[PDB]
Amino acid sequence: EEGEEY
Amino acid sequence: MDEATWERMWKHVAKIHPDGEKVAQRIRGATDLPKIPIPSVPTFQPSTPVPERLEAVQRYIRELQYNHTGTQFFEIKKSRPLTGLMDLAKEMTKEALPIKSLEAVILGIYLTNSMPTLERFPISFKTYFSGNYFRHIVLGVNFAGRYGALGMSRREDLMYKPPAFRTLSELVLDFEAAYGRCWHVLKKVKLGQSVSHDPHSVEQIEWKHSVLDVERLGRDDFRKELERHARDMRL
Amino acid sequence: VEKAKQKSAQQELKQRQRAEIYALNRVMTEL
């Protein structure tokens, strides 16, 4: 959910 | 892809690249472009040990290349029935376009359904770098009681692991160390259940059978929770 | 003949797009 795609 | 989606990809390139307008004008319509071979989907002799098959599966996934274009080419709805995701995996082998981490997980499942002595389970990571959070996922695997992984990442050490780790904890701690080397702090690990080998199964993938809060658990309870998850999967 | 003509055009469209995708991917990979 939270955060951008690594 | 349709004409509007194509223009969106190039418009996005213009913003995320230093000379983004220049890149499109050199590539779009160019008649001298390299012809990219369509990667051969690997098939397996029954005499080939499963770890060797996994090397070939990972090699195929790598040949598609990590998608750095900024546009994901296959939409993955994670709650779709497995049979729908396997139809999509087949299309990925047909279209042969670059992929990112979640697409690689779906592909890895598709390409190992022929291996009933291998169990496959998703492992997602939440990490912290430079004030911000990042999400990653790989396909955990278990062969003959040892753990490894398949997947795709921008970094060599955040995807493929040969199935040699004697415990799930050791596999996950290897990822944690790799993240540490590139200055990411591992915050959460979310581990799924074993995925059916039936590509026509109507059941969903279970992505978050365990959600492990790394800092709140501490070292020893993190390890014990990983070993509990491994037990849940074996039974 | 008409469906064979459409299939040829749709395959050509995908092949041209795929080549530009990989040319773009190399540029972005090396950025």
Please explain how this structure is put together.
Chain C: Belongs to the SVBP family. Chain C: Residues 1-31 form a coiled coil. The complex is a heterotrimer of chains A (6), B (235) and C (31). Chain A contains no helices and one strand. Chain A has 6 residues and is an all-beta fold. Chain A starts with a strand and ends with a strand. In chain B, 35% of the residues are buried. Chain B is 42% helix and 19% strand. Chain B has seven helices and six strands. Chain B has helices at residues 3-16, 20-27, 50-64, 82-95, 101-112, 168-181, 214-234; strands spanning 118-129, 132-143, 146-150, 161-165, 185-191, 210-213. In chain B, helix 1 packs across helix 2. By secondary structure, chain B is an alpha+beta fold. Chain B has one domain (1-235). The radius of gyration of chain C is 14 Å and the shape is rod-shaped. Helices cover 90% and strands 0% of the residues of chain C. Chain C has 31 residues and is mostly helical. Chain C has one domain. The chains are: A mainly beta (6), B alpha+beta (235), C mainly alpha (31). Chains B and C meet through loops of B and helix 1 of C. Strand 1 (4-5) of chain A pairs parallel with strand 2 of chain B.
The whole-angstrom Rg of chain A is: 5 Å
Characterize the biggest β-sheet of chain C. none
Shape of chain A: elongated
Q: Main interface pair?
A: B-C, 24 and 14 residues
- The amount of helix of chain A comes to under 10%
Helix percent of chain C reads over 70%
Q: Would you summarize the structure shown here?
A:
The complex is a heterotrimer of chains A (6), B (235) and C (31). Chain A is an all-beta fold. Helix content of chain A is 0%, strand content 33%.
